[PDB]
From TrEMBL, chains A, B:
Gene: dut
Binding site for Ca(2+): 41, 44, 69, 72
Official protein name in the record: Putative deoxyuridine triphosphatase
Enzyme superclass (EC): hydrolase
Organism for this UniProt entry: Leishmania major
UniProt keywords, alphabetically: Calcium, Hydrolase, Metal-binding
InterPro entries named among the record's database cross-references: dUTPase/dCTP_pyrophosphatase
An example Gene Ontology CC term for this record: nucleoplasm
Length: 258, 258
């Protein structure tokens, strides 16, 4: 699916973004933090579907929002997977080393369907019962600190919903940087300006990116850079405040030296 | 704490409200529905706290909102506990009969604190790390269909936050009816009118209710009725669309006859 070399590079963008929020984020963040953050995005994702039997019956799933929620879970999962790697063996939580069947019960839709290879996520994800069981499962995987499994699920989820996971990751990665530049930590960012959520600008930024461009070993940097520029442009961001992919790769090599 | 007779009566209000949403709700709702609904309120509750390390740092917990989220979890827990009772023994999920330690791992704050008797919820709940571990636990209890335990936790939570759980239940119960009368199912309710969430009107409706009034065997009906009237009044609801407690108790006795 997505190549190991590209996955490495995504981890480096993630690391740089986390460093932008806190310079020694591995030292200050816990495994529980990333699990919580996945839990919170999983319910954001579920609220995209007409799951409520007492409100707004026959609403359509907001699949466009589901794309971004997936990518949000991705961010936090890459982060947890690399917090895990950086945790000393004697600080590894027992729930992540117990057998999987022993730390979760798997939810299953009532109706027949296909799933990912682990059988944790169910397709089509256009179906709300499939999504419910999928993300109730993802929350449990997050509780058992199974970040690498979650990453695999997301990737299978994006295959099924038929969008470019990596392209959207790059777009939202860029937006996350922008929020950090524009007062997200203090009370001052306007996330919904004129009634439009910042996330909803991202879709137009990934229209000309192919699945090939974004995963190709000789094409990807360039492809990522043109997505990043689109998002910075879409938010009228100064050139001096933009970073490109190599700036991220460079911050990554340098700043794994404590 | 809250008396068994009062608890019975709360279940009857719940049953009437559920019947208002769907007349044979025990037949159509599943145990998973109520667990999901608890999961979604638990994250609503957590978003009341400054848990994010990358956004709005040093925000205060919105404890006022936490009160209502607790009550929302209460609604759904009473509902699940009574779906459980109505489930034939041969349809009871295995995760609700397995030993508790076997279907969940308990999250614990880092710092020293007090807890409920089960050790699932941690005090003071003014502390965000206590709330996080508490409600990550509640989600797991919901997954194992432990609705009666959740009800016990909520009750201990409201003791700690120092508000009247039952008074707020009656207020929100009344609001839930109102939303059903005013187009919640179709696209047409305005939940946030002029920038104020409907839930935020409830606080002024419970100012003159004592802990005694609301739990007293000879005082409670009257006390509940005056809370209900306050909420209907606060939402300018026609007298003809209001119900009182005995109307709920009467719908309950009659409509446990299939
Ligand atoms: O240390 C962090 C903290 C946050 N995020 C990002 C990931 C995710 O894409 C975004 C979620 O931000 P939010 O405040 O939950 N807002 P929304 O869910 O609408 O994007 O925050 C990180 O990547 N690393
Ligand atoms: O069958 C149902 C469906 C909903 N609710 C109520 C309980 C809860 O108090 C409320 C939650 O409604 P919501 O749509 O999640 N909105 P909010 O969380 O802001 O109250 O819905 C019931 O009591 N029974
Ligand atoms: Mg979020
Ligand atoms: Mg969202
Ligand atoms: Mg999100
Ligand atoms: Mg809700
Ligand atoms: Mg809420
Ligand atoms: Mg709520």
């Amino acid at each position: 699916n997505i190549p190991g070399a590209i996955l490495h590079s995504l981890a480096e963008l993630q690391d740089g973004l986390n460093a932008m929020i806190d310079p020694s984020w591995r030292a200050v963040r816990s495994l529980d933090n990333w699990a919580l953050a996945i839990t919170m995005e999983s319910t954001e994702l579920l609220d995209s579907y007409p799951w409520k039997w007492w409100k707004n019956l026959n609403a359509t799933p907001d699949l466009a929002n589901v794309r971004i929620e997936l990518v949000d879970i991705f961010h936090f999962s890459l982060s947890g997977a690399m917090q895990m790697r950086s945790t000393p063996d004697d600080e590894i939580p027992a729930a992540s080393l117990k057998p999987l069947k022993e730390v979760m019960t798997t939810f299953l839709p009532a109706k027949e369907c296909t799933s990912d290879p682990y059988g944790f996520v169910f397709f089509p994800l256009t179906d709300t019962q499939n999504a419910i069981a999928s993300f109730r499962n993802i929350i449990q995987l997050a509780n058992a600190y199974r970040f690498d499994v979650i990453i695999e699920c997301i990737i299978y989820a994006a295959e099924d919903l038929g969008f470019n996971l990596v392209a959207y990751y790059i777009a939202k990665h860029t937006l996350n940087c922008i929020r950090q530049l524009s007062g997200y930590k203090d009370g001052s960012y306007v996330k919904v300006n004129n009634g439009v959520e910042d996330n909803s600008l991202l879709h137009n930024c990934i229209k000309d990116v192919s699945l090939d461009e974004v995963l190709d070993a000789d094409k990807y940097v360039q492809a990522w850079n043109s997505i990043m520029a689109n998002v910075y442009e879409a938010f009228q961001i100064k050139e001096s405040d933009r970073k490109d992919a190599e700036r991220w790769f460079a911050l990554a090599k340098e700043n794994r030296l404590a």
